[PDB]
Ligand binder design. Structure first.
Ligand SMILES: Nc1ncnc2c1ncn2[C@@H]1O[C@H](COP(=O)(O)OP(=O)(O)O)[C@@H](O)[C@H]1O
Ligand SMILES: Nc1ncnc2c1ncn2[C@@H]1O[C@H](COP(=O)(O)OP(=O)(O)O)[C@@H](O)[C@H]1O
Lengths: 75, 439, 221, 219
């Protein structure tokens, strides 16, 4: 499996396990559900170096989230 | 095992390290997690672990900054501890280094920290040294004090105070301005082979002392001028923490007859005193021509003196001599001896990938436009040497300044760093610089 | 006088002879004599022979004769001519009551001052040619006599991959292979703290793989 | 603006300058109309503007004479002021330079001033330096005094007083005898290449004082 942590700005951590087969979209769609503002626009980036993923179809193995990783949350 | 050996990093960052997937799986280390690094002289460092397939389990890849912060070099062992618990920075106090700010007055916080730190969330500790690149240079910075202790993570809410008071450089703390392995580009196989030959001796003189096998006393570096042999030799010495003395053929030739020998003798004696040290000959060809080429009796005495010094060099001395020659044809037969310069290194012309690699190293401090492509420029140069590329970059920079800065002509007395920051080099500048090529 | 290409090992032969025959050994190195200033040089030569006569029976060996005494066409220095002259004077000055043997090491016969071919002087001339396979097998054995090899290691096959390699090259090939082996096994563990014992180094064994690696490296010296 | 960068002049005239057609349209400058030039060391100069298609809007073409008069070199910035109100000269007093007259004695007024100042209506200011060419040489001159203040326009009705007394050369003031770009012919692209290479280093040490780029040391 693959462990994806979301670090929120206001010292909030969300630890969610995933499958390496599952796409990026699924997690983004999960985050939309989890957050109380889906309508509000947000972007998930991984640093360092500062970079965001525009691809939702990109798999986690290919993305380099192996086995686990942490990604920051920004709006 | 927590114990690992420092290695060269592929990624070019302050706080980025590289380990093997299994090692991370063994110690349950996550890609973004922050690892604590324990070095020598009771110094500790904080970094961001990363997953690299290429990296071997037993080796860790890290930059010259953390090594210097940890006071460690290549062939030294460090200890990594996971640091799950980490709290954000509340307040930070940093003062720049006198030698980095030289010839720059004005508000540099806005043009160094803001650009460098842009939701980077880099971990830092009180008294840590980090490098920021801006205004076409590399400016080192120190952490004076932090409200959170001992270490913290940089946050955009967190206030960073910067005062225009330099701190006096500390002789224990070597600067990053020095030449490094990362600064050498366009040679892979050549560098690796050179590295390991001198790795063994310089790091462990006591091993070589307690072993029958003798380390190579003399190393010879081939290739045309402008390739960069001095730069190769210099970096190694600094990286290996060995005393480096440079001998210039003209400088030795300039000195009058009878003193030349004295200067050479003095240099060799000095190396023994500060052993283990590295001696490098720049213009060997000038010092020692071929036997048919030399027509001076005094010249022959100088050559003889060098040969006597080379023979004189012992194992106990632990001094490595590195010589550079342009062409093999113009070599004294006597120099090509097992006793003396047994070891010979052939430097071929850098390949297109190597030429591209060189361009990246020269342009790392300066600000490049999106339209500018190094690869295309690298493709256009076939027989251009490392030096030629540097000259092209220099000429391209000057042209870019002439094209923009000359029109404003606001450069009166003190020049603000921020103005220099706004300046970017256009692709056309490089094309204009490339056009004017003639050796 | 010993004819042969550099590396063949003529110094080592002489030196050994002086050791085994329990006779005082005095080595003269061409550069070491040339380094000294005009007049001081002549003194040291004169000082060397008198000291050999004093400690007779003695042996005087010249590592690099060609350097001290190149051919007359190739010499272009008046001082240079005084040093050769001084050597010839020291050679003709030698008596039978001295009981001092003078050995010299040179390379090519065409880089020789005819003056050294005199019957009174260096009459005896010994053309040391490159050893055959056996000879080089004989050297490998010599340079593997302290170190611990593996059963998988075959010198015959190594004595079957160098053609124009001299004693030095094989000695170098031994050195490197040994240093290489240490990197491959000890640099990974790396327990070189304080003093290094024998027990850790006894376990150290050289594979053929080590040799295969060192051979490839291009050394025309 | 009123700010422009000194550039080489194509015309071989001492009291002539040139600007771009658009630049003239912006500042409503007339081709003939005299222009006042302020440089450095609290000095001013008066010249005659011209229209040149080639000239850039932000640059101004000028000769060695005015540079010296303004105590400025190439790359420096000068301020141009329109001067529509200028009054004609009544009485002018000029003394030649000691080094210029060397080897020439007698009445030079008839063979230097008369020829040079024939129906030209040249504008000059008190304490300026101008060059007349006569007797197969270049003879520099200094305006000692003018009845009109500060500046005036030379006229045929105007009387010019010439007395045979040389003024001592001043160390600050550089002579036009010196070699200049104008004195070098038969090199275009090559001069330019040379010029642009040493232009940055020599003019501004401060730029190369605090930069990672090394200037070329040996040419
Ligand atoms: N590997 C390299 N990477 C980048 N620049 C290099 C390299 N080798 C040489 N240079 C450049 O070549 C120039 C000359 O280097 P070097 O050959 O050491 O000196 P020299 O010209 O005296 O032989 C320097 O300006 C240096 O930046
Ligand atoms: N570009 C030029 N324009 C005008 N005169 C020139 C030019 N180049 C050279 N000369 C003239 O050629 C002569 C020699 O010039 P130069 O090469 O500097 O000196 P020399 O011939 O004494 O070495 C001088 O009389 C000089 O004025």
């Amino acid at each position: 499996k693959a462990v994806i942590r979301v670090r929120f700005p206001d010292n909030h951590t969300l630890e969610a396990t995933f499958h390496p087969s599952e796409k990026i979209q699924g997690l983004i769609d999960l985050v939309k559900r989890v957050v109380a503002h889906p309508d509000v626009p947000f972007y998930l980036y991984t640093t360092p170096p500062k970079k965001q993923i525009k691809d939702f179809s990109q798999d986690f193995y290919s993305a380099g989230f192996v086995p686990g990783a942490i990604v920051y949350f920004s709006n | 095992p927590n114990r690992l050996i420092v290695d060269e990093a592929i990624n070019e960052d302050n706080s980025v390290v590289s380990l093997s997937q299994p090692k991370m799986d063994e110690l349950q280390l996550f890609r973004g997690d922050t690892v604590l690094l324990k070095g020598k002289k009771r110094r500790e460092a904080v970094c961001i672990v990363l997953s690299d397939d290429t990296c071997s389990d037993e080796k860790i890849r890290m930059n010259r900054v953390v090594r210097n912060n940890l006071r460690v070099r290549l062939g030294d062992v460090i200890s990594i501890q996971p640091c799950p618990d980490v709290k954000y920075g509340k307040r930070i106090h940093v003062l720049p280094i006198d030698d980095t700010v030289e010839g720059i007055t004005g508000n540099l916080f806005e043009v160094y920290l803001k650009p460098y730190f842009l939701e980077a969330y880099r971990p830092i500790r009180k008294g840590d040294i980090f490098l920021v690149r801006g205004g076409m240079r590399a400016v080192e910075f120190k952490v004076v004090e932090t409200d959170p202790s001992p270490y913290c993570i940089v946050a955009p809410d967190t206030v960073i105070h910067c005062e225009g008071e330099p701190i006096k450089r500390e002789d224990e703390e070597e600067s990053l301005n020095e030449v490094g392995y990362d600064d050498i580009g366009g040679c892979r196989k050549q560098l690796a082979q050179i590295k390991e030959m001198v790795e063994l001796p310089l790091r462990h003189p006591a091993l070589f002392k307690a072993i029958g096998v003798k380390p190579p006393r003399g190393i010879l570096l081939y290739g045309p001028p402008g390739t960069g042999k001095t730069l190769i030799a210099r970096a190694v010495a600094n990286e290996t923490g060995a005393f480096f003395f440079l001998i210039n053929g003209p400088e030795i030739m300039s000195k009058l007859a009878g003193e030349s020998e004295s200067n050479l003798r003095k240099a060799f004696e000095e190396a023994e005193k500060n052993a283990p040290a590295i001696i490098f000959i720049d213009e060997l060809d000038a010092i020692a021509p071929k036997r048919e080429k030399t027509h001076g009796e005094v010249e022959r005495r100088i050559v003889s003196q060098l040969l006597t010094l080379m023979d004189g060099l012992k194992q106990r001395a632990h001094v490595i001599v590195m010589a550079a020659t342009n062409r093999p044809n113009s070599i004294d037969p006597a120099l090509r001896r097992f006793g003396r310069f047994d070891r010979e290194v052939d430097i071929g012309i850098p390949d297109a990938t190597g030429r591209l690699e060189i361009l990246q190293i020269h342009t790392k401090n300066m600000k490049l436009a999106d339209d500018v492509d190094l690869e295309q420029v690298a493709n256009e140069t076939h027989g251009h040497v490392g030096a030629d590329l540097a000259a092209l970059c220099s000429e391209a920079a000057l042209q870019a300044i002439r094209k923009k800065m000359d029109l404003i002509d606001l450069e009166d007395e003190t020049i603000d760093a921020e103005v220099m920051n706004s300046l970017a080099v256009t692709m056309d500048d490089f094309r204009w610089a490339l056009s004017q090529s003639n050796p | 006088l010993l004819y042969g290409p550099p590396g063949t090992g003529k110094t080592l032969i002489a030196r050994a002879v002086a050791n085994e025959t329990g006779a005082f050994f005095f080595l003269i190195n061409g550069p070491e004599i040339m380094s000294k200033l005009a007049g001081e040089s002549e003194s040291n030569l004169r000082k060397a022979f008198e000291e050999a006569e004093k400690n007779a029976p003695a042996i005087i060996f010249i590592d690099e004769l060609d350097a001290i005494a190149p051919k007359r066409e190739k010499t272009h220095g008046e001082v240079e001519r005084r040093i050769v002259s001084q050597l010839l004077t020291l050679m003709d000055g030698l008596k039978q009551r001295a009981h001092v043997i003078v050995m010299a090491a040179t390379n090519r016969p065409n880089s020789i001052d005819p003056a050294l071919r005199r019957f009174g002087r260096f009459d005896r001339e010994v053309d040391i040619g490159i050893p055959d396979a056996t000879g080089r097998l004989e050297i490998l054995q010599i340079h593997t006599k302290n170190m611990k090899l593996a059963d998988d290691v075959d010198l015959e096959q190594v004595a079957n991959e160098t053609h124009g390699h001299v004693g030095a090259d094989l000695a170098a090939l031994c050195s490197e292979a040994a240093l290489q082996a240490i990197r491959k096994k000890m640099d990974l563990i790396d327990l070189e703290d304080e003093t290094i014992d024998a027990e850790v180094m006894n376990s150290l064994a050289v594979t053929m793989d080590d040799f295969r690696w060192a051979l490839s490296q291009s050394n025309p010296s």
